[PDB]
Amino acid sequence: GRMHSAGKGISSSAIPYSRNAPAWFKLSSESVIEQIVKYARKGLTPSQIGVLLRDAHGVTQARVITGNKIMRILKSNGLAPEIPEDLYYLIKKAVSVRKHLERNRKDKDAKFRLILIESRIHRLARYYRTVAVLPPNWKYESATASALVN
Amino acid sequence: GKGKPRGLNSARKLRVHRRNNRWAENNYKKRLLGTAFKSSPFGGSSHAKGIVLEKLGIESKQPNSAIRKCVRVQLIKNGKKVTAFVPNDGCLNFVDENDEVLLAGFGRKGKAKGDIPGVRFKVVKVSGVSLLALWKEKKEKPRS
Amino acid sequence: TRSSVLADALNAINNAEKTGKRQVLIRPSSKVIIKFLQVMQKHGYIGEFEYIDDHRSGKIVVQLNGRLNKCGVISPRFNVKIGDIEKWTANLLPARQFGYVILTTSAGIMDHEEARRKHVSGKILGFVY
RNA sequence: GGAUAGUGGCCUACCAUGGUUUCAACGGGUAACGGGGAAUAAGGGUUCGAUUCCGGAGAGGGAGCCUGAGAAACGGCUACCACAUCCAAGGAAGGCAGCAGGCGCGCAAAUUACCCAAUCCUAAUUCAGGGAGGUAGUGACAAUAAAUAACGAUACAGGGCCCAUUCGGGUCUUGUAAUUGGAAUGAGUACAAUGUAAAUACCUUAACGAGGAACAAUUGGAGGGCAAGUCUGGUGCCAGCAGCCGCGGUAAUUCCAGCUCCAAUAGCGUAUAUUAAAGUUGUUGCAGUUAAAAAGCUCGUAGUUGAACUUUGGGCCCGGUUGGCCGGUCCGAUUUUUUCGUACUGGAUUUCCAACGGGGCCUUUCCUUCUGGCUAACCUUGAGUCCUUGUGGCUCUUGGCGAACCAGGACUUUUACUUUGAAAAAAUUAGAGUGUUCAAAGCAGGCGUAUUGCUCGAAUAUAUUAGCAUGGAAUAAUAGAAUAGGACGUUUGGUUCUAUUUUGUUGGUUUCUAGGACCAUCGUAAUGAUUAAUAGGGACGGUCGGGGGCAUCAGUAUUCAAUUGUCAGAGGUGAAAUUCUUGGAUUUAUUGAAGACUAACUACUGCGAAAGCAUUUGCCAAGGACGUUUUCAUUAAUCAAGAACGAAAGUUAGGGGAUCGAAGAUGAUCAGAUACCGUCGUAGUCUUAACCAUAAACUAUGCCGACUAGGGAUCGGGUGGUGUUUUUUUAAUGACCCACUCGGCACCUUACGAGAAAUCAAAGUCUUUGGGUUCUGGGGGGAGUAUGGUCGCAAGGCUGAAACUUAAAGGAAUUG
RNA sequence: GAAUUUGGACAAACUUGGUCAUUUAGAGGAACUAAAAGUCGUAACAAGGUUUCCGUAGGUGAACCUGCGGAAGGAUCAUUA
RNA sequence: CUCUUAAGGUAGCCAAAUGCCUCGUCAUCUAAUUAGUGACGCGCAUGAAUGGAUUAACGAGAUUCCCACUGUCCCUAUCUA
Ligand SMILES: [Mg+2]
Ligand SMILES: [Mg+2]
Ligand SMILES: [Mg+2]
Ligand SMILES: [Mg+2]
Ligand SMILES: [Mg+2]
Ligand SMILES: [Mg+2]
Ligand SMILES: [Mg+2]
Ligand SMILES: [Mg+2]
Ligand SMILES: [Mg+2]
Ligand SMILES: [Mg+2]
Ligand SMILES: [Mg+2]
Ligand SMILES: [Mg+2]
Ligand SMILES: [Mg+2]
Ligand SMILES: [Mg+2]
Ligand SMILES: [Mg+2]
Ligand SMILES: [Mg+2]
Ligand SMILES: [Mg+2]
Ligand SMILES: [Mg+2]
Ligand SMILES: [Mg+2]
Ligand SMILES: [Mg+2]
Ligand SMILES: [Mg+2]
Ligand SMILES: [Mg+2]
Ligand SMILES: [Mg+2]
Ligand SMILES: [Mg+2]
Ligand SMILES: [Mg+2]
Ligand SMILES: [Mg+2]
Ligand SMILES: [Mg+2]
Ligand SMILES: [Mg+2]
Ligand SMILES: [Mg+2]
Ligand SMILES: [Mg+2]
Ligand SMILES: [Mg+2]
Ligand SMILES: [Mg+2]
Ligand SMILES: [Mg+2]
Ligand SMILES: [Mg+2]
Ligand SMILES: [Mg+2]
Ligand SMILES: [Mg+2]
Ligand SMILES: [Mg+2]
Ligand SMILES: [Mg+2]
Ligand SMILES: [Mg+2]
Ligand SMILES: [Mg+2]
Ligand SMILES: [Mg+2]
Ligand SMILES: [Mg+2]
Ligand SMILES: [Mg+2]
Ligand SMILES: [Mg+2]
Ligand SMILES: [Mg+2]
Ligand SMILES: [Mg+2]
Ligand SMILES: [Mg+2]
Ligand SMILES: [Mg+2]
Ligand SMILES: [Mg+2]
Ligand SMILES: [Mg+2]
Ligand SMILES: [Mg+2]
Ligand SMILES: [Mg+2]
Ligand SMILES: [Mg+2]
Ligand SMILES: [Mg+2]
Ligand SMILES: [Mg+2]
Ligand SMILES: [Mg+2]
Ligand SMILES: [Mg+2]
Ligand SMILES: [Mg+2]
Ligand SMILES: [Mg+2]
Ligand SMILES: [Mg+2]
Ligand SMILES: [Mg+2]
Ligand SMILES: [Mg+2]
Ligand SMILES: [Mg+2]
Ligand SMILES: [Mg+2]
Ligand SMILES: [Mg+2]
Ligand SMILES: [Mg+2]
Ligand SMILES: [Mg+2]
Ligand SMILES: [Mg+2]
Ligand SMILES: [Mg+2]
Ligand SMILES: [Mg+2]
Ligand SMILES: [Mg+2]
Ligand SMILES: [Mg+2]
């Protein structure tokens, strides 16, 4: 179940049995790509990119209709970020929690939550180190953390 | 399932974990700690002979009532004083003070037998003849 | 987290049999499952079974025909030397006159009768009777 | 460098700071020489190995060295240390863990015997020497074989099958004998021979050797377990017995005995250990709600463990094995009649069905390395033609360069695994052969003309790790092209490196030439990125909550106070008393202060990791579930170490101190009353900043995963409903209604299932025993004690024995 | 080439102390057990006569008593009415 | 349970700088200890801010012992101003 909660939720997406399609789309990969990069240069994350494309532009997925998943495109275009989106948002989060700790110092639950979040960050970065997307050393430092999210 | 690791590569845990657990097993620990050689009045040896210091009339445990005839012996090999029961009718008159007697276990592996308290041993020979043979008058105790 | 997949398969079958059903669902669908299901069908302890193509790992619908008592897995898939098959069959089979202990040999997956013939061995997958 | 026979920090000089470790180093212990092997027989295991063979070490303790090929030798020497002998007192000498033998030690272990006859060793050596070794002595270590009696006679009794009318009873066959008689024999004692090195015993054999005071079998036991006395005499909770339950207190089936009886028997008992029994150590294979036992909680490293996919399927060739069938005769041939039916052998190929197994191919598929063969194509020199076009098309010709193709040898990206072998001491073990008279044994022997010979043997299995060799590639790991520093090649440049032969020889140099390494260039190519887990994380969306922190607001009450009106009681209790009261108690009124608390609403309702969380509002960061054709793509599950949080009490201080209230004080009660009840009241109760780390921290029930059953509620979310209700007119919207659906707090019924039961939707899917994984228990006490360590201001926490003791302690249910 | 003798490495061993291991005496102290008997009370088991138990704290001849928080293993599965 | 003048020695501690008897008894240290220490306690006459018990550090304080040291001594001699 959940990694840090004791939750047992299944609320997921549900990708269709349809590696091709849709018969009503009509717009060509080459076009949609130049919209992804348009947004990625306007500073947008893969997650919240395919959210706009799923919504306003009627593009269902990106692995279909272009044959490539969104981030893979950004990297080809040199719009690859510094550190990954998960790791990032985790690090941003952990930062803000600590920033709350620094004034509210009796918030024992706060401290608890930071221990959870930063567990996650390290577990992540460990893997990311394992598959060469972060340098051999790297590691998440708290003191320097606020810097890495700018 | 089961609460024990089942990995094909878990031998170490399964191995140390039982080695760890053999200790709750009394007979094992006695053997490993050499209680036998240390705390036991005999060496671990099956028999010991010592010299009879005094005669004792230890009374029985409940719900019995009698005066079990015993002797405080002092073991030669390690000067230990332990007392031993003297079996059969009036055999207590076969042993004398300062008389050098062979003791044996009560066949309980260290525990006390029956209602005789504190007594974990028995007299088997006395002045080196056999208590059994004396009681049956087929042998005679050599003079003191 | 799922661990054996060939465990939860055989269990569902086992479970569904006991409760009087003549059909099961098996998610997910590993090849090891099917090859096992094959071995288990070659001696008719199950009937027809049909793969279902999710764009994922699969499902299976197996038809049951009674006469199954237990289809078991053995974990960890121990190492069995050739004259040790004799020993497992001794332990986990009902009688000398039937039942099966299917393995994994380099010569594919097969029941213990078969390996006995081809003179091969390896790990143990489980058993059927 | 020295040194050694030589490698090497073996030693030295100089230089670096390295080497080992939770995959347990280092240190401690061993009543530890290692192995072959031994005991225990479902399997798995458990325990043991000083000791016949191999290896090792040592010769009272240490060190040192002479000699020699070999010793750090001890029946060699030298010194120290510890012992200790002879002495004419000056000196001298010894080393039994060799064979005997002695002392000591202890529960515990034999002759100061004979010999080189055997087995083998040594030397100058067929001869000498050998306490090696053999022989005998002592020897109930262990193991083998197995005498202690056999057959008659008769008198009753009768198994008596009957005859049969009756004590009329046939004729063998059991049993009883103060009844009978003839046979048998080695234990012995001993001529002899044999055996032997000489003796001895064994085998063989004359002369003797049996009838009950012998040629006289014992050891335990006779309540249960557990086989066999309710017979007798004795004792009287004594003596004594009893592994355990228990027997004995004047009719003892249990003591002491007589009788008889049982069990094993040349043996039986006891003690101690150990194995089986023990699924009471649990890999197989245990137990943990209540019997012993889930850490208060969450994180987390080591460890263990980890979704699914990549040649699937088709079709050929090839020789293999168990049964159909029948011929043929050994052999017990069966229901029981005659020309009737129950283990043995022969079997190649039939297409006559079946199963099965080995080896090859084809289907895009022998790849990868190398070498050998057969050479195309390819530019190439030289001679020749053709062209509605220099087109170099075609041919032959010179020497280069070897696609494809065939064969053979090496070939796992790197492992685990598995098959088959090889290299493997004997004994032991399993086990084939063999009539030691049998047997334990042994490895012998077997045949014949036995008057100068013949002849089979001394097998086989074994080994569960590691190494080596080999067939396999399912399972499980692992490597590889992503900013292409990608792959392959008959493209070709390069600059580096090595140089076979050719320039006589050798040596230097250099040029062409060849190969390696590498860099570019050129060509060929389907040019290279698996899913998207009812795994996990991240984004997003609207929600939801008594989740958390700071600030802020409120409520009445309680106590107190100032003021207040009135007058005698008020308090408290089962009843009282102590107390308060005409300085007006109590009750009333206005008013203010303080500190805690957060009523009712409040529920089988919500939230959080647990502890726990409930007046308002503002800020502050967090969270599940849901929704989601969003994103990353194994990033995960559980976790020794380690870490956060952790009721109440308690501790260090400041603040605070209304209430209640440990200590204390008191009034009652009691026989007492240190109590319970009543009164006063310290600390405490709250907060801040530090500690503490424990509770029945409870569901007395680890977590993740999957599966098995029926129903109604309810919380959060979402979807569907020409449903209801709300206006001024019936739209949005709010609440509500119905169905669905996730994810929750629970409840109900059920019982296939589980359990000792109570009961349990898990406590089920367990002798049809295995999804992954963390922790704990192994009779009751002693005892959470002692001791050591550690953390703490302290209280204490964490870690945590043993001696001894004991037959139950304990659970659930039942009837009293 | 003997006595004799310089230095060196090897290095027994002596004196003094340290340490680790294995043992061990001790006045006296403080426990447990045999143990079921006795004296004092009656703490627990029945609502055990103040429900019991847990953690903590203090106090008492003795069992125990009291405060604060907890558990039910309670003497209540229960007030949509 | 009792006598008595208000009550009747708790927690501790000890032959202690508080103990008569007393050079207490036991253990320890020594060849030998009216000494020292550790223990015992009906303690003439210990004892709780007339403070009781503990106590690291400190002391030209009283006291015991060890090692070192030494003409203090055995046992005296010699030199300088
Ligand atoms: Mg799930
Ligand atoms: Mg987790
Ligand atoms: Mg005595
Ligand atoms: Mg060398
Ligand atoms: Mg070197
Ligand atoms: Mg260093
Ligand atoms: Mg050993
Ligand atoms: Mg030894
Ligand atoms: Mg040995
Ligand atoms: Mg051993
Ligand atoms: Mg020994
Ligand atoms: Mg030697
Ligand atoms: Mg000796
Ligand atoms: Mg020589
Ligand atoms: Mg020698
Ligand atoms: Mg020597
Ligand atoms: Mg000698
Ligand atoms: Mg000797
Ligand atoms: Mg002698
Ligand atoms: Mg003896
Ligand atoms: Mg003996
Ligand atoms: Mg000889
Ligand atoms: Mg000779
Ligand atoms: Mg001669
Ligand atoms: Mg006889
Ligand atoms: Mg006779
Ligand atoms: Mg008898
Ligand atoms: Mg019987
Ligand atoms: Mg009688
Ligand atoms: Mg009996
Ligand atoms: Mg009798
Ligand atoms: Mg058990
Ligand atoms: Mg329990
Ligand atoms: Mg607990
Ligand atoms: Mg897998
Ligand atoms: Mg060899
Ligand atoms: Mg291989
Ligand atoms: Mg998914
Ligand atoms: Mg989230
Ligand atoms: Mg008034
Ligand atoms: Mg309120
Ligand atoms: Mg821990
Ligand atoms: Mg009081
Ligand atoms: Mg008073
Ligand atoms: Mg009190
Ligand atoms: Mg606890
Ligand atoms: Mg589950
Ligand atoms: Mg249900
Ligand atoms: Mg939907
Ligand atoms: Mg809920
Ligand atoms: Mg039932
Ligand atoms: Mg009893
Ligand atoms: Mg009960
Ligand atoms: Mg009852
Ligand atoms: Mg003391
Ligand atoms: Mg005392
Ligand atoms: Mg009571
Ligand atoms: Mg009570
Ligand atoms: Mg209990
Ligand atoms: Mg008076
Ligand atoms: Mg007092
Ligand atoms: Mg007091
Ligand atoms: Mg005193
Ligand atoms: Mg003092
Ligand atoms: Mg004094
Ligand atoms: Mg002295
Ligand atoms: Mg003195
Ligand atoms: Mg003193
Ligand atoms: Mg004073
Ligand atoms: Mg005072
Ligand atoms: Mg003071
Ligand atoms: Mg001073």
UniProtKB/Swiss-Prot annotation, chain A:
Source species of the chain: Saccharomyces cerevisiae (strain ATCC 204508 / S288c) (Baker's yeast)
Name of the protein: Small ribosomal subunit protein uS15
CDD domains: Ribosomal_S15p_S13e
Any matching Pfam family: Ribosomal_S15
Subunit structure: Component of the small ribosomal subunit (SSU). Mature yeast ribosomes consist of a small (40S) and a large (60S) subunit. The 40S small subunit contains 1 molecule of ribosomal RNA (18S rRNA) and 33 different proteins (encoded by 57 genes). The large 60S subunit contains 3 rRNA molecules (25S, 5.8S and 5S rRNA) and 46 different proteins (encoded by 81 genes).
Keyword NADP: no
GO terms classed as biological process: cytoplasmic translation; maturation of SSU-rRNA from tricistronic rRNA transcript (SSU-rRNA, 5.8S rRNA, LSU-rRNA)
Subcellular compartments: Cytoplasm
Family matches, as SMART domains: Ribosomal_S13_N, Ribosomal_S15
Modification type Phosphoserine: residues: 31
InterPro entries registered for this protein in UniProt: Ribosomal_uS15, Ribosomal_uS15_arc_euk, Ribosomal_uS15_N, uS15_NS1_RNA-bd_sf
Glycyl lysine isopeptide (Lys-Gly) (interchain with G-Cter in ubiquitin) crosslink site(s): 38, 42
Gene3D superfamilies: 4.10.860.130, S15/NS1, RNA-binding (1.10.287.10)
Gene Ontology molecular function: any one: small ribosomal subunit rRNA binding
Disulfide feature: none
Function, as annotated: Component of the ribosome, a large ribonucleoprotein complex responsible for the synthesis of proteins in the cell. The small ribosomal subunit (SSU) binds messenger RNAs (mRNAs) and translates the encoded message by selecting cognate aminoacyl-transfer RNA (tRNA) molecules. The large subunit (LSU) contains the ribosomal catalytic site termed the peptidyl transferase center (PTC), which catalyzes the formation of peptide bonds, thereby polymerizing the amino acids delivered by tRNAs into a polypeptide chain.
UniProt xrefs under PROSITE patterns: RIBOSOMAL_S15 (PS00362)
Family the UniProt entry places it in: Belongs to the universal ribosomal protein uS15 family.
One GO CC term on file: cytoplasm
Keyword terms, alphabetized: Cytoplasm, Isopeptide bond, Phosphoprotein, Ribonucleoprotein, Ribosomal protein, Ubl conjugation
Gene for this chain: RPS13
Swiss-Prot record, chain B:
UniProt keyword Ion transport present: no
Primary location group: cytoplasm
GO annotations of cellular component type: cytosol; cytosolic small ribosomal subunit; ribosome
The record's account of how the chain is modified after translation: Hydroxylation at Pro-63 affects translation termination efficiency. The stereochemistry of the 3,4-dihydroxyproline has not yet been determined.
This protein's UniProt keywords: Cytoplasm, Hydroxylation, Isopeptide bond, Ribonucleoprotein, Ribosomal protein, Ubl conjugation
PTM-bearing positions, type 3,4-dihydroxyproline: 63
Crosslink position(s): Glycyl lysine isopeptide (Lys-Gly) (interchain with G-Cter in ubiquitin): 55
Known partners and oligomeric status: Component of the small ribosomal subunit (SSU). Mature yeast ribosomes consist of a small (40S) and a large (60S) subunit. The 40S small subunit contains 1 molecule of ribosomal RNA (18S rRNA) and 33 different proteins (encoded by 57 genes). The large 60S subunit contains 3 rRNA molecules (25S, 5.8S and 5S rRNA) and 46 different proteins (encoded by 81 genes).
Family according to the record: Belongs to the universal ribosomal protein uS12 family.
Name of the molecule in the record: Small ribosomal subunit protein uS12A
Species of the source: Saccharomyces cerevisiae (strain ATCC 204508 / S288c)
Swiss-Prot record, chain C:
Xref: Pfam families: Ribosomal_S8 (PF00410)
Cellular component, GO, one term: cytosol
Main location class: cytoplasm
Domain of life according to the entry: Eukaryota
An annotated Gene Ontology molecular function: structural constituent of ribosome
Any one Gene Ontology BP term: cytoplasmic translation
Protein keywords: Cytoplasm, Ribonucleoprotein, Ribosomal protein
Cell location: Cytoplasm
NCBIfam families assigned to the protein according to its UniProt record, in alphabetical order: PRK04034.1 (NF003115)
Subunit structure: Component of the small ribosomal subunit (SSU). Mature yeast ribosomes consist of a small (40S) and a large (60S) subunit. The 40S small subunit contains 1 molecule of ribosomal RNA (18S rRNA) and 33 different proteins (encoded by 57 genes). The large 60S subunit contains 3 rRNA molecules (25S, 5.8S and 5S rRNA) and 46 different proteins (encoded by 81 genes).
HAMAP family noted in UniProt: Ribosomal_uS8_A
Miscellaneous comment in the UniProt entry for this protein: Present with 40400 molecules/cell in log phase SD medium. There are 2 genes for uS8 in yeast.
Name of the featured protein: Small ribosomal subunit protein uS8A
Organism: Saccharomyces cerevisiae (strain ATCC 204508 / S288c) (Baker's yeast)
Lineage: Eukaryota, Fungi, Dikarya, Ascomycota, Saccharomycotina
Protein's gene: RPS22A
